[PDB]
Amino acid sequence: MDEFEMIKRNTSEIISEEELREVLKKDEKSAHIGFEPSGKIHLGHYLQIKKMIDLQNAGFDIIILLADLCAYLNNKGELDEIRKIGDYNKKVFEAMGLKAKYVYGSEFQLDKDYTLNVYRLALKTTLKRARRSMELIAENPKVAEVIYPIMQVNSAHYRGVDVAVGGMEQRKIHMLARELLPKKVVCIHNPVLTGLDGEGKMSSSKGNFIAVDDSPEEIRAKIKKAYCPAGVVEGNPIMEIAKYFLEYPLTIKRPEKFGGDLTVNSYEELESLFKNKELHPMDLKNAVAEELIKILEPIRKRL
Template sequence: MDAYERVCRNTVEIITEDDLQALLAQPQKKVYAGYEPSGEIHLGHLVTINKLVDLQVVGFEVTVLLADLHAFLNRKGTMEKVHELAEYNRRCFEGLGLKNVRYVLGSDLQLNREYELLVLQLSQQITLNRATRSMDEVGRQMDHPTVSQMVYPIMQMADIAMLGVDAAVGGIDQRKIHMLAREHLVNFGYKAPVCIHTPILNGLDGKKMSSSQGNYISVADSEEDIKKKCQKAFCPPEIAENPILQIFQHHIFPRLPGITIRRPEKFGGDREFANYTELEAAYGKAEIHPLDLKKACGESLAEILAPVREYIS
């Protein structure tokens, strides 16, 4: 696939596609994604990590922001706790393939005069209502938002400006914050970033993925745990909202050249698939049993995550 196809695969939207095409033609291009240090790195994070790997392959300089101050503002723990998690998260990202990229600790970037002045300038342009709405899908306990959570999206806009990047990667839940950045950064002489949005995947139970619910697979899980979790996962006959198929589409096929569904001859024998489209079509025709699909998912995912466990151990 060409560079444009690689960047666009497994995304929800690109804002805008024309801007992306123009950016790809540039000899130098920079992209970033920010992560709150708030616990285990799991398959939810891996969606954007895979996209950063794609972007690095097609020539982007990648920056990963370890957003310790954002985590603190969003009630994710003390500064001491998030600092400790930031270093652990960095090791996980490296183990997942994000090497030879720039890692920036949020507090190193954000606690200076130029940055803080830009935050204050942006805050004069953004209404409290828009700041609140931009945090609806990102913030914790938004029934009773704090002032710190209203600062959060404005700082994220300033991050884009101060990091000097051309594009921002995030889940679709980041869309409202990115739209604020595109609208307002130009007023202060900064470019409007290309925004690359990835989907929010289901947890293993088919519901929203959540650390508190334990319905996720961590990149640090053992091979045995990964396989057990996949075997217990929700896997309906339908394709839509199927968490096991989502893992194949967004995690396994981007990293493996193909997969094999292993089964006895009396059940049809082994089936090999070179891409996700073929697998989805076969499953949709009931040619693959859910139990066989889940077994192959666990085996493939354990293979993909094995280097991470070795790297961070």
């Protein structure tokens, strides 16, 4: 599995593969991703940071943009409080093994130059196209909703990044960047993790997440409570966790009573067992809780 394939692994989409291969051919390459500072860092974040780690291993300089301005505007606290959360986020990301440079949105997003270009971009972007780009991320829709995608695009341009990484929900905004900017950004899109209740995406504000520093008993309790319908793989958070975070061979342990220990050599194997209902939701949960704990331990320990 070469550098390209290591980057591609577990992504939903790369726009475009041909363009990424060209990026790979150069010494100096950067990749960026934006996060709003968050009191809790969960599996949703972890999945994306693993992807950034794949990229640095391929020779990319990594830049994390912390959206402190977005938080501040949205009544979530003063800049200093938010910088404190942002700085905690840096520690977590480091604990995960990522070696990155960090930039806060407020450091450049109010620069005269940047703003002027937000207004330039807004004369070139239709409202319809702007709103369309926001459907996957967006009551009483505010004008801020159509400013947001333009700022994202403008940031891509201001920082001169080669590759932009984000979840699948960011894809139309990235498409917008590739049609509005002089230089086409290569886009790498990660799957959107389902929350533990199987309802929406995993979110810090929806209380449906596993945080990377949750205690073992908290992880076990949260897994036990998860949505995990037998034979159903679509929208199954426990299966997603198995696909994106666990290492194979995986051992699922069961009493002899019920078929004994089961050893699976790939997620695809694990998938067929579950579809046929040869693997019971309870034994899967058990195995996932325990493996997840061992995976997260060194992160939580460093914290």
